[PDB]
Design a protein around this ligand. Sequence first.
Ligand SMILES: NC(=O)c1ccc[n+]([C@@H]2O[C@H](COP(=O)([O-])OP(=O)(O)OC[C@H]3O[C@@H](n4cnc5c(N)ncnc54)[C@H](O)[C@@H]3O)[C@@H](O)[C@H]2O)c1
Ligand SMILES: NC(=O)c1ccc[n+]([C@@H]2O[C@H](COP(=O)([O-])OP(=O)(O)OC[C@H]3O[C@@H](n4cnc5c(N)ncnc54)[C@H](O)[C@@H]3O)[C@@H](O)[C@H]2O)c1
Ligand SMILES: [Cl-]
Ligand SMILES: [Cl-]
Ligand SMILES: [Cl-]
Lengths: 177, 177
Amino acid sequence: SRFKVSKLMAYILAHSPWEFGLEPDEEGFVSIEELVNAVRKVYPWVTEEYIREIVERDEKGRYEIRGNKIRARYGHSYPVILRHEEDKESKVLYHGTVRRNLKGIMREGIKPGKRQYVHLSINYEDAYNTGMRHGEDVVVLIIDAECLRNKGYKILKAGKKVRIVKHVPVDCISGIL
Amino acid sequence: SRFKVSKLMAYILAHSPWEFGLEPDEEGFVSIEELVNAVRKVYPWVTEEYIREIVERDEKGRYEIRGNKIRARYGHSYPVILRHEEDKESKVLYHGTVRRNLKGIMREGIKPGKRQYVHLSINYEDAYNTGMRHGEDVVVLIIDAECLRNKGYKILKAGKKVRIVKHVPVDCISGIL
Ligand SMILES: NC(=O)c1ccc[n+]([C@@H]2O[C@H](COP(=O)([O-])OP(=O)(O)OC[C@H]3O[C@@H](n4cnc5c(N)ncnc54)[C@H](O)[C@@H]3O)[C@@H](O)[C@H]2O)c1
Ligand SMILES: NC(=O)c1ccc[n+]([C@@H]2O[C@H](COP(=O)([O-])OP(=O)(O)OC[C@H]3O[C@@H](n4cnc5c(N)ncnc54)[C@H](O)[C@@H]3O)[C@@H](O)[C@H]2O)c1
Ligand SMILES: [Cl-]
Ligand SMILES: [Cl-]
Ligand SMILES: [Cl-]
């Protein structure tokens, strides 16, 4: 299925490319035919046209093709240089987490942890879906983006609905749902 | 949670699809995006990727995806046409029920009742758990599957653990757990 192939694409591109012999450039980009060969290791119906259709029909916009190079735009577990467009439009953003983290967040703000950035969503639905990775008892913080920027933070457009920012101080959290 | 959304998928696919606007075919298949859109009236965060993940991780293999369509494989409360492969490898199967039904079963054998088929399990554990739906005083009948096949019956692979047979005569009940 496209879903299964996409999961392997995320694994290869965002998490363990070297296991397959790929060498991401400093922005995550690999050659698409190396990627296609690696995916056929597992799913041999896959071709370059199939990879491209997945990229182009992705509602997240989580993949990016440039020439015959391809990457995950965001969410890697390894360091990448993220040179993304600034979001200046959004007034409200959302961060999904589990309730046990509120204690930390309300006194520390939202911190990027082991990533370069904190990940937000322009929709509460997406923030909830992502906050679910850490457990059942999901809460979604409402974030004041104009307040973020006025503190001097820049908000980048990592995906269609994903937004990233170095940090969210408590002052910028305007509700919990 | 995956629990609640799987329960809603079971309700929709196996019990009440019409109330959601879906129109199962003669085999119980609905379009996946129709299903996703139905589930999102209750759990608005649910995506098609989340539903495909549930199908994949279901330890029963109770859902089936065929192309862009999805069904419950067995266990509907409404009548559906069942074209599953024949199980020839299992030698013993299990039927979980409650003690009060023993008087009926030993008089008559195991009867499909409202369903097209009796539902058996590959696994003693799962037979027990399913039997608990009808009360707390559960007994699991050991069924001679080789006997059923020598008697004519065709046993089918409804699920990865579920097997279905039209009727189990008393002569085929090898014991009581
Ligand atoms: N969480 C969201 O709202 C959201 C939005 C869009 C995309 N995503 C995607 O999900 C993945 C990242 O998941 P994630 O956002 O859970 O990050 P993560 O998986 O790296 O986990 C970091 C966790 O730390 C928690 N945390 C942050 N500040 C804290 C503090 N001060 N004290 C205690 N805990 C704190 C966060 O809420 C989060 O649960 C990426 O692929 C990203 O693109 C998440
Ligand atoms: N019974 C099991 O061990 C078992 C195994 C695998 C899956 N399941 C699943 O459980 C769901 C319901 O299955 P079920 O088997 O509980 O059936 P069911 O819920 O449709 O109820 C039928 C009941 O009638 C009882 N019965 C059968 N013959 C009888 C007789 N002659 N006299 C009196 N009572 C009699 C059965 O033991 C059962 O308790 C289905 O989705 C099915 O796939 C059940
Ligand atoms: Cl990922
Ligand atoms: Cl505007
Ligand atoms: Cl059910």
